[PDB]
């Protein structure tokens, strides 16, 4: 929600992206996140979670529904590879506009 509040007023041309480095599998939230997923899809904010020591189901659906990618750390060397891969710009999909 904080990221959405800041990114809502961002220009349409730029690609709004979020990389959640998830460590604790639990997610205690005041409101259901499935509803927020709809707003994220409407706002075309790509969210690509990187989980740690857990294949979180809510984040799996988050990533695939919002268009981002989900991954889990095999080790520190693979963590380096994952973040270095995320460095590069992501391809623009149909929803993306220039």
């Amino acid at each position: 929600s904080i990221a959405m509040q800041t990114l809502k007023h961002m220009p349409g041309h730029t690609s709004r992206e979020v990389l959640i480095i998830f460590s604790s599998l639990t997610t205690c939230d005041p409101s259901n996140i499935y509803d927020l997923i709809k707003t994220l899809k409407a706002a075309k904010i790509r969210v690509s979670v990187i989980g740690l020591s857990a294949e979180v189901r809510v984040c799996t659906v988050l990533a695939r529904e919002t268009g981002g990618t989900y991954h889990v750390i095999l080790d520190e060397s693979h963590y380096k590879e994952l973040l270095t891969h995320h460095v590069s710009p992501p391809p623009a999909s149909s929803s993306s506009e220039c």
Partner: protein
């Protein structure tokens, strides 16, 4: 995907099949070619159904005369709905391949309560109530009165079905239960009776066991029409228990009092009938002299003559006598008494009730009660239960036993004693299926080793093969934890149940496993009392609060409403990132009914080997009789009952679609060779000695690593 099976060519809808599927299909074709009953096990909850259905359809096409039709039975209606979905997909694939419709029919039967279109019976959900209301509406008296067309609510659907469906049968197609309800509404016919008639000409029929095992209702729809049909029972590893339940009848003091009141109402109704209409209803006596459904199977059932009970008053007095004998025999306060033949002999001697007249008691009850034009059978149902017991006891006691419990368990003194008539061997009741049908395939998942099953059920198997799931990835990584952080034995023995150290080890293991495991976890205990004791100990200690912080915790209770609400919230917790830890009992109906899939019950925890209490006297008859006949050791059968139950309650996580998941058994007993040997082959082969007896911490670490491996894509 056309597979060039050794026997023939078989179509298949999905793109690829694992080698276990090839082995399954070839073994199944071998059994069908031998035309002999057999048993086989397949790991996957789903996929086996499609392979089996495709092979059966191809075999039917190749040798239509060999197999008349397929009778595929599933545990529950919610489960059989998935089967009908699979069959519909397969039929659509085959129809697309052929380019045209073929004379193939497939349908599912279900209770009038589950499916019906009458608004009066719609609000009511209780099955006996639906049965009684439907019997009243469709009664021969109501039909004759409908012929008169007098002012009275008559159920038009059955009449319209009699007028139309009798003349015209449904050409072909696949109809789920819900879709069949819509078809019945559209055509003004019964979704129930239409399917019942289609059973005469249906290629595939699917219904639960209680539609095919209990002689009361099974026989009528499983008549000799299917002389040579492929009958298949799916996931029917708990077939002995259901087959026994189809025979066991429980008599209680409250039920007996209700029976007495119903009998008084019966007498009053008989007097009213005598004063109002006597000759027309007396014609029943003539047809009786000429000579709720009977519980006697095909050959056991007899219809020579009703016996000495030839009139309403005589039959009523006979029931009064037998009810008085049962009432006193139950009121006696003493230790549990077993008396299969001695009960019949003592009844005959004490109250002068001969076994031959007692044999036809239930059948004459059905006929005489029909004569009375009663409002419904729901009110008198307890009397019909007592009559079924009365006829069964006089029918046979060679492989049965009457147990009397003046005092119930869990109560030092209770004024509601119970008389059980629990069976001891399922072969007696399942004999008609094997004998009538040319071949029966008991396809099951999580099956404890097949060798026992022929001993329990008297049949000569053709093939005995165990199929192991093979995938490019190790979907399942089961483990057994017997040593805690204290390196102390963690066996959940009866004498070791009270051990606070063992309870603490279980709590700490659950805490760490919940910390590492992703959302969704289910832990199965051995009993409600043991689960409550462990929960209370964890509550007194701080372990439970830490578990609550780490993840949400839900618990099961005997009450079905609370169970359903808790499971409904558990599903939402699994969907969300909170996660959930569902504590349940292995014998709980929730464990058998529920199915766990991807992101549901990810890590299955088994706290203690599931063993039934060693005080319930019913199991004593069931067990010592098996020792005496068929020569099964008491410990052997007990460990088999534990391993089969554990496999049932732990095999859900591998439902289908190759969804990862780990099965952890927190009991050193599972590490014993006998338990491992009796464990299903597919789980055991994956299990290895390296992880056989991991400490709590080691198990947690390996679980974390395995979850890491499974997280990444193929």
């Amino acid at each position: 995907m056309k597979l060039n099976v050794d026997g023939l060519l078989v179509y298949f809808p999905y793109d690829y099949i694992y080698p276990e599927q090839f082995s399954y299909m070839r073994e199944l074709k071998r059994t069908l070619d031998a035309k002999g009953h057999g048993v086989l096990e397949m790991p996957s909850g789903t996929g086996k159904t499609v392979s089996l259905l495709a092979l059966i359809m191809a075999y039917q096409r190749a040798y239509p005369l060999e197999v008349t039709k397929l009778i595929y039975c599933s545990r529950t209606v919610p489960e059989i709905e998935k089967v009908i979905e699979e069959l519909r997909k397969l039929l659509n694939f085959y129809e697309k391949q052929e380019g045209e419709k073929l004379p193939f029919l497939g349908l599912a039967l279900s209770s009038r309560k589950n499916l019906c279109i009458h608004p009066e019976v719609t609000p009511l959900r209780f099955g006996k109530d639906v049965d009684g209301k439907c019997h009243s509406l469709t009664a021969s008296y109501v039909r004759a009165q409908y012929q008169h067309d007098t002012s009275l609510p008559h159920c038009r659907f059955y009449e319209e079905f009699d007028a139309h469906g009798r003349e015209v049968p449904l050409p072909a197609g696949i109809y789920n239960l819900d879709d069949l309800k819509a078809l019945g509404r559209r055509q003004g016919w019964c979704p129930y009776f239409l399917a019942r008639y289609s059973i005469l000409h249906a290629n595939v029929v699917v219904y639960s066991y209680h539609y095919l095992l209990d002689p009361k209702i099974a026989d009528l729809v499983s008549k000799e029409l299917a002389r040579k049909a492929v009958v298949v029972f799916d996931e029917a590893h708990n077939i002995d228990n259901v087959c026994i339940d189809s025979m066991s009848v429980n008599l209680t003091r409250r039920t007996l009092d209700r029976c007495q009141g119903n009998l008084e109402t019966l007498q009053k109704t008989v007097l009213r009938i005598k004063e109002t209409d006597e000759q027309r209803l007396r014609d029943e006596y003539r047809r009786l002299v000429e000579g709720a459904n009977p519980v006697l199977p095909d050959e056991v059932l007899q219809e020579a003559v009703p016996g000495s009970i030839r009139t309403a008053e005589h039959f009523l007095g006979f029931l009064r006598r037998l009810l008085e004998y049962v009432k006193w025999r139950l009121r006696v306060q003493h230790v549990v008494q077993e008396s299969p033949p001695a009960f019949l002999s003592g009844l005959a001697q004490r109250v002068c009730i001969q076994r031959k007249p007692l044999r036809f008691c239930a059948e004459r009850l059905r006929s005489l009660l029909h004569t009375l034009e009663i409002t419904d059978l729901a009110d008198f149902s307890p009397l019909t239960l007592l009559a079924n017991f009365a006829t069964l006891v006089s029918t046979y006691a060679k492989g049965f036993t009457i147990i009397i419990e003046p005092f119930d368990d869990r109560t030092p003194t209770i004024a509601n004693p119970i008389l059980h008539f629990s069976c001891m061997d399922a072969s007696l009741a399942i004999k008609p299926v094997f004998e009538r049908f040319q071949s029966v395939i008991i396809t099951s998942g999580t099956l404890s080793p097949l060798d026992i099953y022929p001993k329990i059920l008297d049949f000569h198997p053709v093939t005995m093969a165990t199929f192991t799931m093979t995938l490019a990835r190790v979907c399942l990584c089961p483990m057994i934890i017997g040593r805690g952080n204290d390196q102390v034995a963690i066996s959940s023995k009866f004498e070791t149940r009270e051990d606070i150290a063992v309870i603490r080890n279980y709590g700490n293991l659950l805490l760490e496993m919940s910390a590492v495991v992703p959302d969704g976890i289910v832990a199965f205990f051995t009993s409600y009392q043991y689960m409550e004791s462990t929960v209370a100990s964890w509550y007194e200690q701080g372990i439970l609060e830490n578990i609550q912080r780490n993840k949400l915790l839900f618990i099961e209770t005997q009450d079905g409403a609370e169970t359903s609400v808790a499971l409904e919230k558990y599903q939402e917790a699994c969907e969300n990132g909170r996660g959930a830890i569902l504590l349940s009992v292995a014998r709980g109906k929730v464990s058998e009914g529920i199915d766990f899939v991807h992101h549901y019950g990810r890590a299955v925890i088994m706290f203690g080997v599931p063993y039934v209490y060693t005080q319930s006297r019913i199991l004593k008859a069931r067990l010592e009789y098996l020792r005496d006949q068929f020569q099964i050791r008491e410990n052997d059968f007990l460990t088999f009952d534990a391993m089969r139950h554990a496999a049932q309650c732990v095999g859900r996580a591998i439902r289908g679609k190759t969804d990862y998941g780990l099965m952890v058994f927190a009991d050193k007993r599972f590490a014993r060779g006998d338990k491992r040997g009796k464990l299903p082959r597919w789980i055991q082969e994956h299990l290895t000695d390296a992880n056989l007896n991991l400490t709590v911490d080691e198990g947690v670490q390996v679980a974390k690593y395995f979850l890491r491996q499974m997280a990444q894509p193929f």
